[PDB]
Amino acid sequence: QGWKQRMAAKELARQNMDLGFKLLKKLAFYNPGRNIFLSPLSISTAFSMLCLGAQDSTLDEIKQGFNFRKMPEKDLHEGFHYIIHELTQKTQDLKLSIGNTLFIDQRLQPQRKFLEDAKNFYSAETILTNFQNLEMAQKQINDFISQKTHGKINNLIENIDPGTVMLLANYIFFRARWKHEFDPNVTKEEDFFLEKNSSVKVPMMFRSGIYQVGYDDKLSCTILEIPYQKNITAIFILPDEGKLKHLEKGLQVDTFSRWKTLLSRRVVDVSVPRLHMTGTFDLKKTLSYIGVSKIFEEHGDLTKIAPHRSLKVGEAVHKAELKMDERGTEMETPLVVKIDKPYLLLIYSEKIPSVLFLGKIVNPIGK
Amino acid sequence: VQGWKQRMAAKELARQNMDLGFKLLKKLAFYNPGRNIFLSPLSISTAFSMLCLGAQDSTLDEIKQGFNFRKMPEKDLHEGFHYIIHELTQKTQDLKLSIGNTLFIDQRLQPQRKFLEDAKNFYSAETILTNFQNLEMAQKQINDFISQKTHGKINNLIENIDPGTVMLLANYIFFRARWKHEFDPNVTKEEDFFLEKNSSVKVPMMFRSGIYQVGYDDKLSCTILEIPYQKNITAIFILPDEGKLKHLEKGLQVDTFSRWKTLLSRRVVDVSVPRLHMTGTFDLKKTLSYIGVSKIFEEHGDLTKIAPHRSLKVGEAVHKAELKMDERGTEGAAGTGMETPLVVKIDKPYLLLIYSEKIPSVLFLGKIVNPIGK
């Protein structure tokens, strides 16, 4: 019946919503005035997969920071196997792929149990790499990712710290058709105001129709939902002028369960910018913001990966990519909501409630 | 009319190119013994025929001499290769084939429009401006372009750029195709591939039983198998008997293949073919030295039609061919969804030829000494 696997996925996806908001708060604090676009779910798959090979302090600190301690390990890996499988899709209405690749030096001896578990549960490959020549190792890695991602992720690695013998690559892609397509001709190049007096011309889409919309008088932010076809929803949170920081600080799962109350089906004249977002994150620095570091340190806890006490994830990279355009399947006083100022974006799956992406878009055409 | 003249030029160019390929394979295997040699002689020819659009005097004459372009007018040379590229270039489910020519020129130079338009119209070749004053950035700019254009099939094309380079040529070709009759991925076991006498290695070995054009040449002591693709292309496996590959290389010609075709016949065969993900990268400066072409990589006054500069020369030139051979193929056409089966196991060093049938052309030419090596 898949009942247990689907329950683990729902609990893991729910707990992951909390992680996403914690990372967004820290990433926006340490990187102000910059786009922050990531996939908390994708990041979680990578470090749940590493729990297949971690022990003692490293394993406990990973489960603590990601909140994996609430369920058994057997169900943790069975839940993520369900999540990845359901999501992993190459259809016309949804192009989604979650990639996890662990590069290990070829002189080390990866354990077969880990290798097979990582491939079966997470579809994660373990590639032998020549970390004795970092110039060669960097070329091996980038060539592998470029091939696997069909030229979408090229030059994934641009620097390898000296001493690296293991590197983790996490990458995700998303391309979905809206429930009601936007008119490509009504899409004009409008202004996106970076500040109260700083503008840039960006392609701005437009459509009028029924959307669940509201306003949160606590955070002073408007909430709009533009639905995708394949049971996914794009949630645009447009804060009022000067309340973006206030929104960032107060964002919580309690806020997520609360915004649902303020929604209602209404006719809205929506103006949404197009997006082709790519986010690259050093997972060593990012995870430090949530108290995970031992996995990137030598403690002798990764012997189940390769029999060596000095083993550690020397470098870890996350890459999130999303393309939002007009493609799609196809009453009262019209409302007006034009996203023409810094906003937050959440791509929320409805089956297996999961936050696929979490974005702070300060410039839809910046990079 | 009907494209007859263009299609005749293409056939004459493709035929002459078979001779070049066998000449290059012999020289590359001599200077690179015990290694896989996988290249596309046709792709290399498109690159240096395209440069004939902008070369003059000694450089132009030496290219036409070394590549044997002197036999037909230049108008027909470029119309023939334009036809070859057009027919081959496909991005369908049954065949993904693309031949790429990209000229990277330093941004201080001014590429001439006549050359740019002819190279784009006849050969689909792009001319991208690069900042060769920062060689690290130039190498990443180039490789990222190729990876993006080829969807990650041709990666890290360039690995080194000599200081002073102001022009760089990248020629690259990749290949994916569906067999006429797919192989069962489940029957694909890891069998032995004998690198030498009593020296074996485990390689993924595909298997299928069906009708194939097969034969055997008791003179050169080699087996000839043809596994056809769907879109009018054929994989030609020449399997020498143990220790007979070296003799075969010395003397391989089109005449040899024309004779082997006599020894073929449609027969039921239990074929065992290794899986392949071949990549070959070649410095075209050294490769073309084996056929007497060098001036294009030297400073003469012959490249002014490309860019007006007295010191202009092709500072670097790289060829990269990429191919993947796996089980993918058409479905539902064998048995239900005849005679004594023969047995052909490609389990020792062999030659591979990807042969186009409309415009008889050797798309790829490979010496596989180890299907999982290199």
Curated annotation (Swiss-Prot), chain A:
Expressed in visceral adipose tissues. Glycans are attached at N185, N197, N231. GO terms for biological process: gluconeogenesis; lipid biosynthetic process; negative regulation of gluconeogenesis; negative regulation of lipid biosynthetic process; phosphatidylinositol 3-kinase/protein kinase B signal transduction; positive regulation of insulin receptor signaling pathway; positive regulation of phosphatidylinositol 3-kinase/protein kinase B signal transduction; regulation of cholesterol metabolic process. The keyword Hydrolase does not apply. GO terms for molecular function: molecular function inhibitor activity; serine-type endopeptidase inhibitor activity. Inhibition of KLK7 is enhanced by heparin. It is found in: Secreted. CDD domains: serpinA12_vaspin. Adipokine that modulates insulin action by specifically inhibiting its target protease KLK7 in white adipose tissues. This is Serpin A12. The lineage of its organism: Eukaryota, Metazoa, Chordata, Craniata, Vertebrata. The gene is SERPINA12.
